[PDB]
């Protein structure tokens, strides 16, 4: 569907100022960003892979695709949003006692096939995403 380029560069900066719910409170509910987290954790559960009885394998790569018109209002940077959301989702997987392989990376990207006021987040266990 969308072959990625081989990038092992797992963007690393120590954002001690991590923002997750900040987006909702900034827009003041004009748009509901938290609806993403909601469906994201839902998609995480839908992507749970039956592994050893101790703990289930949760998705690591989440492709969050919104409409162009939504994304532009969110802001053109995937990076800062990715940092906040990945850290938040990674916290969730710990909380649920799930495990994964690689690094939890959430991708925010837009597609013209995706309409305004719509978003889709698909998380899967993807080891073919080198996160070094």
Measured between alpha carbons, how far apart are the two ends of the chain, in Å?
24
State CA 65 to chain mean position distance: 10
Helix or strand (DSSP H, E) at 111: strand 105-111
Helix or strand (DSSP H, E) at 71: helix 68-74
Question: Where do the domains of the chain lie, and which CATH numbers do they carry?
Answer: 1-132 (3.30.2320.60)
Method in brief = NMR
Spatial separation of the C-alpha atoms in residues 84 and 13, rounded to whole Å: 12
Closest by CA to 47, choosing from 126, 129, 101, 123, is 123
Helix or strand (DSSP H, E) at 119: strand 119-124
Helix or strand (DSSP H, E) at 23: helix 22-27
102 and 127 Cβ atoms separated by less than 8 Å: yes
SS3 label, residue 110: strand
Give the CA distances from residue 62 to residues 16, 26, 36, 42, in Å, rounded to whole numbers and listed in that order: 22, 24, 11, 12
Spatial separation of the C-alpha atoms in residues 22 and 6, rounded to whole Å: 31
């Amino acid at each position: 569907m969308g072959s990625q380029k081989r990038l092992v560069q797992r963007v690393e900066r120590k954002l001690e100022q991590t923002v997750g719910d900040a987006f909702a409170r900034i827009f003041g509910g004009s748009i509901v960003p938290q609806e993403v987290e909601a469906l994201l954790r839902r998609e995480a559960a839908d992507g749970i892979q039956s592994l050893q009885g101790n703990r289930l394998l949760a998705p690591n790569e989440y492709i969050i695709t919104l409409g162009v018109h939504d994304f532009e209002k969110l802001g053109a940077d995937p990076e800062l949003k990715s940092t906040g959301f990945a850290r938040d989702l990674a916290d969730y997987i710990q909380e649920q006692g799930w495990q994964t392989y690689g690094d939890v990376v959430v991708r925010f990207e837009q597609s013209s096939n995706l309409h305004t006021g719509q978003f889709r987040a698909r998380g899967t266990v993807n080891p073919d995403v080198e996160t070094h």
